[PDB]
Structures are given as structure tokens and as C-alpha cells.
Write an enzyme that holds these catalytic residues in place. Structure first.
Site, PDB file in Angstrom:
ATOM      1  N   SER A  74      41.060  43.870  50.886  1.00  0.00           N
ATOM      2  CA  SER A  74      41.022  44.427  49.540  1.00  0.00           C
ATOM      3  C   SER A  74      42.364  45.092  49.275  1.00  0.00           C
ATOM      4  O   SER A  74      42.706  46.080  49.932  1.00  0.00           O
ATOM      5  CB  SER A  74      39.877  45.424  49.388  1.00  0.00           C
ATOM      6  OG  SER A  74      39.904  46.051  48.122  1.00  0.00           O
ATOM      7  N   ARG A  75      43.122  44.557  48.318  1.00  0.00           N
ATOM      8  CA  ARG A  75      44.456  45.080  48.060  1.00  0.00           C
ATOM      9  C   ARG A  75      44.435  46.329  47.191  1.00  0.00           C
ATOM     10  O   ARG A  75      45.439  47.046  47.138  1.00  0.00           O
ATOM     11  CB  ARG A  75      45.329  44.004  47.412  1.00  0.00           C
ATOM     12  CG  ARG A  75      45.623  42.838  48.338  1.00  0.00           C
ATOM     13  CD  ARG A  75      46.432  41.758  47.647  1.00  0.00           C
ATOM     14  NE  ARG A  75      46.533  40.554  48.472  1.00  0.00           N
ATOM     15  CZ  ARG A  75      46.337  39.310  48.041  1.00  0.00           C
ATOM     16  NH1 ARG A  75      46.030  39.063  46.773  1.00  0.00           N
ATOM     17  NH2 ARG A  75      46.457  38.299  48.887  1.00  0.00           N
ATOM     18  N   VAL A  76      43.325  46.600  46.503  1.00  0.00           N
ATOM     19  CA  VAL A  76      43.131  47.918  45.910  1.00  0.00           C
ATOM     20  C   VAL A  76      42.845  48.938  47.005  1.00  0.00           C
ATOM     21  O   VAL A  76      43.453  50.013  47.053  1.00  0.00           O
ATOM     22  CB  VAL A  76      42.005  47.869  44.865  1.00  0.00           C
ATOM     23  CG1 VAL A  76      41.455  49.259  44.606  1.00  0.00           C
ATOM     24  CG2 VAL A  76      42.511  47.242  43.574  1.00  0.00           C
TER      25      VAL A  76
END
Ligand SMILES: Nc1ncnc2c1ncn2[C@@H]1O[C@H](COP(=O)(O)OP(=O)(O)OP(=O)(O)O)[C@@H](O)[C@H]1O
Ligand SMILES: [Mg+2]
Lengths: 342, 117, 52, 136, 284, 52, 86
Positions: free
Chosen positions: A204-206
Site C-alpha cells: 500500500s503506497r498510501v
């Protein structure tokens, strides 16, 4: 057949009582799957909080190509009013096929796999509508009727690969569009590891910005610990009589991988996940090294649900974490180990 | 539809046990190939035999295959299938030859063929 | 006898715990029985009510 | 006290400081105190008593060997298995038979067996050369 | 070619590379355990060779066949080899050196005999036709002396019985963690001690029961340790050689991956264009 | 030393006798919880179906 | 694809077998006849089953051929029997 629809509709069911409205768009699904999905949604009490948009496998391709845009508009209605919505597109990789059909029937020039030229601009202009929008936007859109709210729409598109070749055309487009992927591995799913999420390749890049504090504190190691456990357990098959230091890593990893799998329609609140991960991370599982460990989890949840409900309320309401809560959890685990049975 | 909730725990456990035994045999096959069988541990020398008997028992003579083989066909109820595999895995038939299970119907035919064999 | 008392305490603990486990699995089974009875009664109730 | 070594051909068995020992040499029992004169003898299979300084007593079983004592030092070159005119000839007879036939055993390295069969199957039939244009 | 056919072989070679990496790790650990077991064996042979030197080259030097150079008319070798492949060139260098020396000996018209430790040499020398007379195989990672008793007993009996002369042991000397050299060394007649025990003048042992029957047993036990020592050094050399060989094999696999991926890329480009050109050219 | 041994043995046996009673009382508590919640669900699901 | 879909069976002739001297280079196992024994004299039908099983076991073991002399003797017998049938 690796639990994509199950994960999606469980993510829907879990929103029974949050402020998030839910939307489920099914593209190319066979009618029996939709019947089962609706029965499960009303059985678990989630139907009153969700919209179901249906374009079954036998309906004209035009209806299947335009379904996710209708669902996105129905969720964007809530987004623009300062509320929260979550929309699941079931098989975008079938919307692409229906669009290919409708495009070829209009004689439009083809591209890499016969998919039309603008197939990227098919998914892009869809998934770019999943956004969190600031308070000034919703205030100006609603002409001043709402002031403090920030609206948002969350999208969970589903993509089906063939033999796990992520590098295919539509999968590598949508991976270039989204902000992360939950890769579900088939050889983990067949081995009974369910949900079969594959660490390492999934991200998850968030990331932790969207994670409640207690979960962020407890979960920091798990992903890398599990990926290194998997590679070490791949090495292990060729190496019997192996170092007793890795002998412990290859057992803690084997217990955590046995802990992170659960029944299908059983969503678990942040407190129930949190204290289970606390038990697993702070070594309290190190003496249950016989894999009677599902009973341990169930008995721990029942015990905490009987006695310390006032702590679960605090965790669920605040999500906060403190040295005082650390001590409270130490106390719960110590009192559970010493006085109960799995 | 292969999950405990619709097939019952007995059927599910029998199926998962058959698959586990056959997977373990597929693992042991290459240690047998290299180091010979007399090197296997005495519980592995039993997994081998039970997997080898399972692998025979789930063959079957069809009524329509008779024109290919001449032997008569057999119809096996699900109860007899579960009873047979659940018996084999638990060692109730460790005394029969392997060929007592090849191309038979119910387990009664296995015991009767071994008695004839 | 001190080390025998050690072993006695530990054996007594584990015996009591394995004795509790049979009480629990018993409750789980009763549960599985009574919920099946309830489901069957509900099913027959539906059959008759819909036939009416 | 004096230094005592009990050493086998494979690994060492005792290296402490001792005050006296007792053994059954081939010609009778025999007790070694400090300062004993240099002596060489065979010892029969059986126990040997060590008393470590501060008087701690222990018993070591030996399958035989040779005891050699020096000024202020002593060593027991212990055998690792029972030795004898008949036993060694039986072992040599089997070692000869196994060579007059062509009978050979299986090494116990199950790990090497697993890895070797996996690599033999993985490398098999993959037609890489003539797929890549590599001459060699 | 075919893009899928090439991706399948890329996957196969990646799996092979992974297997070879695991083997390198296992060998690199067994090498340490083996080379420590190698050091655990020195004291016996050292403290027994000092005794043999005292009884043999000291004062009242006694006389024994194993100590003196009777004339040579046939020779004997104890050959240690691995039980497992993938050890690189370890065994064949040693067997070729042995064949060179054993041929030089038969130029002079002398006969030669062999005793085999390990399965590989047993397989080899029967193909070459060597005169193996005793063997032990299946030692693996656990070499016992109580199993070497047999063939060493055969060679000792053939020596003192008058048949053999000047017997040898051939083995690999472990020198560095990446350097092992095949050596042929002489065990009997006993090699000459560098040191002098003239300083032992000032004392003599109280030999119970009697010195000659005791020197006989001392010498027999000594050749055994030195053989056993040769076996354990050869085993550590095997582990080090397998480590190096699997390292090389992992790098060869890592280069075949590069070549196969270039071929796969060309294949998939050609497939995309050959399909899309057919589509576009088909539309009148 | 033996009068220390008696004290320690008796104290640890008392501890273990307390622990066993605690464990089995909590086992009966769990049994009651399971059975009463099963009784509740046996009506919740029946009412659900008969309204469906 | 069309003709393999239409017919009742296939005889696959392969160049890697032809080069090695196996002539006629029919590749068994990969080659199928769906008429089977129904188109054989009963003597040939009797005798062919052991050839099918021998070559099938040989195909299962063939991966270990270039590692032979490492193998057990009980599988060495199958491996060198399949070679003689071929
Ligand atoms: N967590 C779980 N535990 C047990 N069973 C599960 C779990 N998740 C899914 N399953 C089972 O796996 C089967 C496949 O699930 P699901 O249909 O969600 O996968 P899918 O990828 O959506 O299937 P497809 O995409 O092929 O239609 C279902 O029948 C379901 O019962
Ligand atoms: Mg699905």
C-alpha cells in the site's frame, strides 16, 4: 478462484456500522453469484447500507461496459456531499473485454492484444474518480450547505490474472493506475492459507498514514517478517539439521502465517485484531508451538469479550495506544495464559 | 462445494487426508529413487504403502468400458467410497496386497480379491 | 520429594486443563446440536406457513 | 595433582586435573598417583575411576586402549570399539566379501538426495542451448 | 521459440538457480562442522607418534617389519573418495594422479592392489578394471573408525603376511577453504620423524607387560588414526568443493536467465506485431 | 533443610490445588456463556427465517 | 489445430529422436490412438500393455538418466529396461 469476491464483499460487510456507504458493481458475473451475494448481504445485515449494480454475464456488452461508470456516479453522489463511500468493481478485466467487443463491432483500430487504443483511458478515467476531496470543494459544490466535511470515494477494483503473470497488458495498466495491490496467490489458497495474501509483492503506497495508531505500532514488522519467513522456509526444504537461531525465526513465522487466516464471513474489529497481533508479536504464542492455535485465538477473543469489554470499547472508539494500554494488554495476556485453556 | 459446511466434516476430512497422503508420497518418490526404499523411516515406509494402495483403489471398472476390457463394471455409493478410503488411511487393510485394490468396486471386493489372490 | 512435588504440581495443572477442555468441547457440540434443531424447526415452520 | 587426557581417535573424552586414577591394565589392576614413574601398558575394556582435585569422583567406561604415563602427565589412548583377534577378522572378512561381490550401500544424506533429484528434474529436457544462440 | 515456451524455461532455470543456492548454503555449513571434527582428531595421532618414536628411533631401538624397508615387489593403496556427486573435479583429479603413479609402478613390473573408501572410487576402478580387494561404502557425513577397521586390517594383514610392500594412502589435503590438493602419502614403512628424542635420554618407560608386543599394537593403532585422519580431511575437502561448484553453477544459471529473457522479449515483440498486422491488413 | 522441603512442597501443592479449581470454574463459566448464547441465537435465527 | 481436432489419433514424428537414430521416430505417450486395442489382434493387444507401462515408467524415470550411477538399483533396472524397449 482465490477469494477475490469473498475479500471484497467481506470488506463491504465490515462497513455495516461505519459512516461509509458501500457500492458493489458486478461486471460479467453469473446470476447465481449475484443471488448468493445478495442473500449474504441481507443475511449479515449489510444490505441496508449498500447499492448493488448488476450487469450479468448474458446481458449485452454495452450494459457491461457502462456499469462501473454508473456505480462510480452513484458513489460520487455521496463523495460530493462530504460523506464517505466505498465502491468495488468486480472484474474490471471483464469490462475491458466488453469494451473490446463493442469497439471491434464498430470497426475501430485495435492495439496490443486487440484491446482498443484507449483501453488505458478506459480504466484511468474511471479510477481517477476515486478521490478524497477537500472541504472547500464540497463547500463550493453544495453551495455552502456543508462546511466542515471532506468527501471521499474508495475504489477496490478486481483483476484476474492467468497463471499469475502480473506483467500482462490490462493488469500492468491497472497496476500503473492504482496506489497498491493485494496480490492473492493461488498456491497459498490451495494450501488452506485463506485469505491468501502474498506479502512482499503486495503493498500500500498510501501506507501507515491511513492506519490507526495501535495497528501501526503492532503491525510494523509483520510484513517483512513473513516475507523473510517464506524465503527461509523455501530454503529449509533442502537443509535438514539447521541452525537453532533460524530454527526460531522459521517457527515464529510459521505461527504468524498460521494466525493470519480466518473464516470467510467473520469480520474482526480493530480491537480484536489488535490484541491478537499483540499476543503474536510479544512472544505469548511461543509456548503454543503445537498448531492448536485457532482455538487459542477464539478463546482469547471470548475471554476478552467477557471481562475487559471496557478496554475494547476504548480501543474501538479511539484507536489510540499508550504505555498504559501496553500494560493493560500485558495484564490481559498474562491473566489469559495462566487461567484458561484453548 | 468441497468444504465442511456442505459435504460434512467426514467427507471433507477423508478428501483432505487422501490428498495429503498422495502429496507426501509424491515427495517421498525421489528419495526412494535415489537412496532406495530400505533407507526410509518405518512410518514413511507405511505412508508409501498406504498412498500406493489409495492410488490403486480410486481406479474403477466402468460398465461402458467393458468392450475395452471384458471385465464387468461396478457402481460405488458415496458411503462405501468414504468407508473404503477412511479405512485404508487408518491402516485397517495394511495386510492386503496392493493389487487387491486395482480395478475393484467397493472395499468388500478388495478383501475378497485378496482372499482369492 | 521436592522435585516430585514439582512434577506433581505441573501434572496436576495439565490434568485440570485437559479436563476443562472436555467440558468446553462438550458445550460446543451441544451448541451445534441445538442450533441444528432450531434451524430444522424453522424450516418446517416455513414449509407449512408458505403452503398456507 | 597431574594432568590427565582421555583421548579417542575421534574426539577427546577428558582433560581435567586429577589426583589419582585406577585402571585394569592387561596384567592386573593398577593405580596411578602423582609422580608415578614413566610407564606404558595396555588396558582392558572396563571402567576407569577419576578423582578430580577437590576429590570429585567419576567413572568413565573405556572399550580398551593404551595407557601411557609420564612425569607429571598421563594419557589414555582409548579405543572407540571393542578390539580383538576375532572381531577384527570378522570385520575384515565382511570388507573382503563386499569387494569380491559388487555390493554397495546407500549414504544417509537425504538432504543431498532431495536436492539432487530436484535439480536433476529441473535441469531435464529444458532445451536452452539451441534456444538461445550460444555456440560454445 | 514461442513466448510461453520460453517463459516456462526461464521459470525452470530460476528454480534451478534457487536449488543450487540452497545447496551452496548447506555445503558451507557442513564444511565448518567437518573441519572442526578434523581438528578434534589430531591429539591421538600426535601423542601416539611421540610414543612410537620413543620405542622405535629412541634408545634400544626395537626391530619391527613396519619400520624397515624390505624390497618392493607389489604395492597397495588405500583410496578415499566421496559418496556423493556434484563435488566438482575433486575425485577425478585424485584418481588420475593415482593412475599415473600406479602406472609408473607397473612399468617396473610390480603388481598393485587397491582398497576403496567411498562408492565413487568403487564405481570408477571397476570400470577401469583395477584390482580392488576390500571396500567400505556408505560412510556419508558420519565416518566411523570402527568401520575403517576392516579394509585397513586387510591391508595390514597382507603386508605382514609378506605379500604387499610399501602401501600408500591417497586422499585430498584440505589446505584452504577454496584450495584442496590430491596427495599420495606413505604410511608404512613408517615415515622418518623430523624430531629427535635424544632428549628423552633421561627417562625410560616401565613397560608392562613387555615392549615388543606393545610396539606392535601401537603401530597398528597408529596407521588406523592416520587413515581415519585422511578420511575426515577428504570429507571436509568434499564439502568445500561442493560449495565452490554450486557457487559457479548459480552464476551460470544467472547468466542463462539474461540470455533467455532477451530471447523472450524478441519473441513477444514479434508476436504482438504479427497479430496486429494481420488484424489491420485483414480489414480490406 | 528437610523442614524447608516440607514447607515448599506443601505451599506448591496448595498453589496447584487453587489453580486447578480456578481453571475448572472458568471452564464451567465458559460452558454457561456458550450455552446461553446458543439459546439466544436459536431464537434470533428462527425469527429471521420466519420473517423471511 | 484443425486437423488434430478432426482425426481419431496422431502419430507425432520428432526430429530430436530422428537425429539420435530412433527410426521410425514416433514419440509415444505424446502420440494417441483412440481406437486402441479394438484395432489389434488379441495377441498384440495382450502383449502391448506391458510395453506401454514399461515406456511410461521409463518416461517417468528418464530425468535421472544423466545422473545414473547415483541411482538405486531397483530403479536402475527400470531405467535400463526402458532403454532396451526403445
Ligand atoms: N477466507 C476463506 N475461508 C474459507 N473459504 C474461502 C475463503 N475465501 C474464499 N473461500 C472459498 O473459496 C471459493 C472461491 O471464492 P471466491 O469466489 O471469492 O474467489 P474468486 O476469485 O472471486 O472466484 P472467481 O474469481 O474465480 O469467480 C468460494 O467458494 C469460497 O467459499
Ligand atoms: Mg469471483
Amino acid at each position: 478462484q482465490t477469494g477475490k469476491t469473498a475479500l471484497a464483499i467481506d470488506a463491504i460487510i465490515n462497513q455495516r456500522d461505519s459512516g461509509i456507504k458501500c457500492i458493489y458493481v458486478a461486471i460479467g458475473q453469473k446470476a447465481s453469484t449475484i443471488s448468493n451475494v445478495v442473500r449474504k448481504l441481507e443475511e449479515h445485515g449489510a444490505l441496508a447500507n449498500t447499492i448493488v449494480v448488476v450487469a450479468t454475464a448474458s446481458e449485452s456488452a454495452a450494459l457491461q461496459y457502462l456499469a462501473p461508470y454508473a456505480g462510480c456516479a452513484m458513489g460520487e453522489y455521496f463523495r460530493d456531499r462530504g460523506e464517505d463511500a466505498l465502491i468495488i468493481y468486480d472484474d474490471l478485466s471483464k469490462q475491458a473485454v466488453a469494451y473490446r467487443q463493442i469497439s471491434l463491432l464498430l470497426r475501430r483500430p485495435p492495439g496490443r492484444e486487440a484491446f482498443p487504443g484507449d483501453v488505458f483511458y478506459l480504466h484511468s478515467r474511471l479510477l481517477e474518480r476515486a478521490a478524497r476531496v477537500n472541504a472547500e470543494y464540497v463547500e463550493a459544490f453544495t453551495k455552502g450547505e456543508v462546511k466542515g466535511k471532506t468527501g471521499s470515494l474508495t475504489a477496490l477494483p478486481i483483476i484476474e490474472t492467468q497463471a499469475g503473470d502480473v506483467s500482462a497488458f490490462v493488469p500492468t495498466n491497472v497496476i500503473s493506475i492504482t496506489d497498491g495491490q493485494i496480490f492473492l496467490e493461488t498456491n497459498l489458497f490451495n494450501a488452506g492459507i485463506r485469505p491468501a495474501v502474498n506479502p512482499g509483492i503486495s503493498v500500500s503506497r498510501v501506507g501507515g498514514a491511513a492506519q490507526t495508531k495501535i495497528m501501526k505500532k503492532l503491525s510494523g514488522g509483520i510484513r517483512t517478517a513473513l516475507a523473510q519467513y517464506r524465503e527461509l522456509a523455501a530454503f529449509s526444504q533442502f537443509a535438514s539439521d539447521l541452525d537453532d537461531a533460524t530454527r526460531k525465526q522459521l517457527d515464529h513465522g510459521q505461527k504468524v502465517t498460521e494466525l493470519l487466516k480466518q473464516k470467510q464471513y467473520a469480520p474482526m474489529s480493530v480491537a480484536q485484531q489488535s490484541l491478537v497481533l499483540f499476543a503474536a508479536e510479544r512472544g505469548y504464542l511461543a509456548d503454543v508451538e503445537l498448531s492448536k492455535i485457532g482455538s487459542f485465538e477464539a478463546a482469547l477473543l471470548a475471554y476478552v469479550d467477557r471481562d475487559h469489554a471496557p478496554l475494547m470499547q476504548e480501543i474501538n472508539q479511539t484507536g489510540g495506544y499508550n504505555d498504559e494500554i501496553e500494560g493493560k494488554l500485558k495484564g490481559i495476556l498474562d491473566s489469559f495464559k495462566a487461567t484458561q485453556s484453548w | 462445494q468441497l468444504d465442511p459446511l456442505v459435504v460434512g466434516q467426514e467427507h471433507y476430512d477423508t478428501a483432505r487426508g487422501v490428498q495429503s497422503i498422495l502429496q507426501r508420497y509424491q515427495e517421498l518418490k525421489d528419495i526412494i529413487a535415489i537412496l532406495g526404499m530400505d533407507e526410509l523411516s518405518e512410518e514413511d515406509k507405511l505412508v508409501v504403502a498406504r498412498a500406493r494402495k489409495i492410488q490403486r483403489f480410486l481406479s474403477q471398472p466402468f460398465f461402458v468400458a467393458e468392450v475395452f476390457t471384458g471385465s464387468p463394471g461396478k457402481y460405488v455409493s458415496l458411503k462405501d467410497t468414504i468407508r473404503g478410503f477412511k479405512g485404508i488411511m487408518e491402516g485397517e487393510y495394511d495386510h492386503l496386497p496392493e493389487q487387491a485394490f486395482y480395478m475393484v468396486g467397493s472395499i468388500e471386493e478388495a478383501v475378497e480379491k485378496a482372499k482369492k489372490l | 520429594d521436592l522435585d516430585l512435588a514439582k512434577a506433581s504440581a505441573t501434572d496436576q495443572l495439565k490434568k485440570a486443563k485437559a479436563e476443562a477442555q472436555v467440558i468446553i468441547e462438550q458445550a460446543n457440540k451441544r451448541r451445534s446440536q441445538i442450533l441444528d434443531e432450531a434451524k430444522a424447526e424453522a424450516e418446517q415452520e416455513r414449509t407449512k406457513i408458505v403452503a398456507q | 595433582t597431574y594432568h590427565l587426557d582421555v583421548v579417542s581417535a575421534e574426539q577427546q573424552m577428558f582433560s581435567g586435573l586429577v589426583e589419582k586414577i585406577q585402571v585394569t591394565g592387561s596384567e592386573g589392576e593398577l593405580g596411578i598417583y602423582p609422580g608415578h614413574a614413566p610407564l606404558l601398558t595396555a588396558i582392558k575394556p572396563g571402567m576407569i575411576r577419576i578423582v578430580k582435585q577437590h576429590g570429585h569422583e567419576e567413572f568413565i567406561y573405556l572399550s580398551g586402549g593404551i595407557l601411557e604415563v609420564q612425569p607429571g602427565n598421563v594419557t589414555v589412548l582409548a579405543d572407540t570399539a571393542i578390539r580383538g583377534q576375532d572381531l577384527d577378522e570378522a570385520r575384515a572378512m565382511e570388507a573382503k566379501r563386499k569387494a569380491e561381490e559388487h555390493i554397495s550401500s546407500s549414504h544417509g544424506d537425504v538432504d543431498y538426495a532431495q536436492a539432487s533429484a530436484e535439480l536433476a528434474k529441473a535441469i531435464a529436457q529444458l532445451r536452452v542451448i539451441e534456444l538461445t544462440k550460444k555456440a560454445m | 521459440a514461442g513466448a510461453k515456451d520460453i517463459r516456462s524455461k526461464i521459470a525452470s532455470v530460476q528454480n534451478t538457480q534457487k536449488i543450487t543456492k540452497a545447496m551452496e548454503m548447506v555445503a558451507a555449513s557442513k564444511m565448518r562442522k567437518s573441519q572442526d571434527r578434523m581438528a578434534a582428531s589430531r591429539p591421538y595421532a600426535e601423542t601416539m607418534r611421540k610414543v612410537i618414536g620413543h620405542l622405535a628411533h629412541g634408545n634400544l631401538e626395537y626391530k619391527h617389519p613396519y619400520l624397515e624397508d624390505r624390497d618392493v615387489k607389489r604395492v597397495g593403496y588405500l583410496v578415499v573418495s566421496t559418496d556423493r556427486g556434484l563435488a566438482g573435479g575433486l575425485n577425478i583429479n585424485l584418481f588420475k594422479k593415482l593412475l599415473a603413479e600406479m602406472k609408473t609402478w607397473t612399468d617396473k613390473g610390480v603388481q598393485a592392489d587397491l582398497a576403496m573408501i567411498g562408492s565413487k572410487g568403487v564405481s570408477f576402478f571397476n570400470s577401469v578394471g583395477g584390482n580392488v580387494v576390500a571396500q567400505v561404502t556408505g560412510m556419508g557425513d558420519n565416518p566411523s573408525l570402527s568401520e575403517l577397521i576392516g579394509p585397513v586390517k586387510v591391508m595390514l594383514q597382507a603386508y605382514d603376511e609378506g605379500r604387499l610392500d610399501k602401501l600408500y594412502i591417497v586422499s585430498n589435503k584440505f589446505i584452504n577453504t577454496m584450495s584442496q590438493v590430491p596427495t599420495i602419502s606413505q604410511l608404512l614403512p613408517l615415515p622418518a620423524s623430523d624430531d629427535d628424542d635424544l632428549k628423552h635420554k633421561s627417562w625410560d618407560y616401565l613397560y608392562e607387560p613387555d615392549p615388543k608386543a606393545l610396539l606392535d599394537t601401537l603401530l597398528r593403532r597408529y596407521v588406523e588414526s592416520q587413515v581415519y585422519q585422511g578420511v575426515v580431511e577428504n570429507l571436509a575437502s568434499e564439502q568445500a568443493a561442493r560449495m565452490v561448484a554450486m557457487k559457479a553453477a548459480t552464476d551460470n544459471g544467472g547468466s542463462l536467465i539474461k540470455e533467455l529473457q532477451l530471447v523472450y522479449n524478441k519473441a513477444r515483440q514479434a508476436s504482438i506485431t504479427q497479430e496486429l498486422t494481420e488484424i489491420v491488413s485483414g480489414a480490406a
